[PDB]
Amino acid sequence: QAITRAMADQARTIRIPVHMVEVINKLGRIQRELLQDLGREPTPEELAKEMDITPEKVLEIQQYAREPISLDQTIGDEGDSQLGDFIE
DNA sequence: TGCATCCGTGAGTCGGGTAATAACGGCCTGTACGCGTCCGTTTCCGGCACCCCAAATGAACCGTCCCTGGCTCCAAGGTGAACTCTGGGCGACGAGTG
């Protein structure tokens, strides 16, 4: 319990409440299970049916689950400049 | 007292973005939102106290901008001649014509 709560609290750069972290992980787990079962990636409608929640909420959770990227990571093929040099 | 062992220095210029795992009830509340009722506001129909206001309704009105009277006082129209081309008619004479 302590490890999972701390993971949900401090895992991501943008804090996500545990109530949303739990559903994010559940959606991902059963999505991978459905992909394994079917042989093809489950569709958003199928994922919504499995969640017993609306596809709009499924898509909102999916876009919420995204994580930020480093502004200082090398963007070129070699090491020449960072992503922070390409943002206005 | 060297000696290897890091240890840290430095080494040129104008295609983009890629991912895990067991986690799951159950209860509290905090702020935003929704429901029902109630009341000051303001917004619009109507009336005289009258405030009158006015183009529209009666004059003159008289100077001026229209008529009539007639009187002229002059230049256009009508009247001659003769005359100087303008022209018609006429006579003379010949050399190609018969």
Side-chain angles (χ1 to χ4, degrees), chain A residues 1-18 20-51 53-88:
Chain A
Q1 175 262 358
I3 289 176
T4 319
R5 205 259 300 282
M7 200 155 257
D9 215 318
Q10 306 154 18
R12 324 178 105 84
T13 302
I14 296 114
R15 219 277 306 270
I16 307 273
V18 200
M20 206 65 146
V21 182
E22 287 167 3
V23 59
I24 284 184
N25 289 337
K26 175 182 167 219
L27 159 72
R29 163 185 49 119
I30 76 168
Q31 175 263 292
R32 285 262 170 191
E33 291 183 34
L34 195 37
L35 163 144
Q36 179 64 58
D37 159 4
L38 201 153
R40 186 191 25 101
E41 44 95 6
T43 69
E45 41 188 5
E46 294 164 17
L47 286 183
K49 297 311 154 211
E50 247 293 350
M51 291 335 278
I53 210 86
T54 192
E56 308 92 288
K57 195 137 300 184
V58 152
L59 230 50
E60 179 143 353
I61 285 168
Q62 282 271 54
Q63 57 92 7
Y64 268 174
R66 273 194 274 114
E67 84 296 330
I69 52 182
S70 212
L71 204 63
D72 297 323
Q73 69 168 65
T74 285
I75 188 52
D77 319 334
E78 322 160 343
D80 310 62
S81 44
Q82 310 161 31
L83 178 58
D85 318 311
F86 282 30
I87 311 301
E88 302 141 1

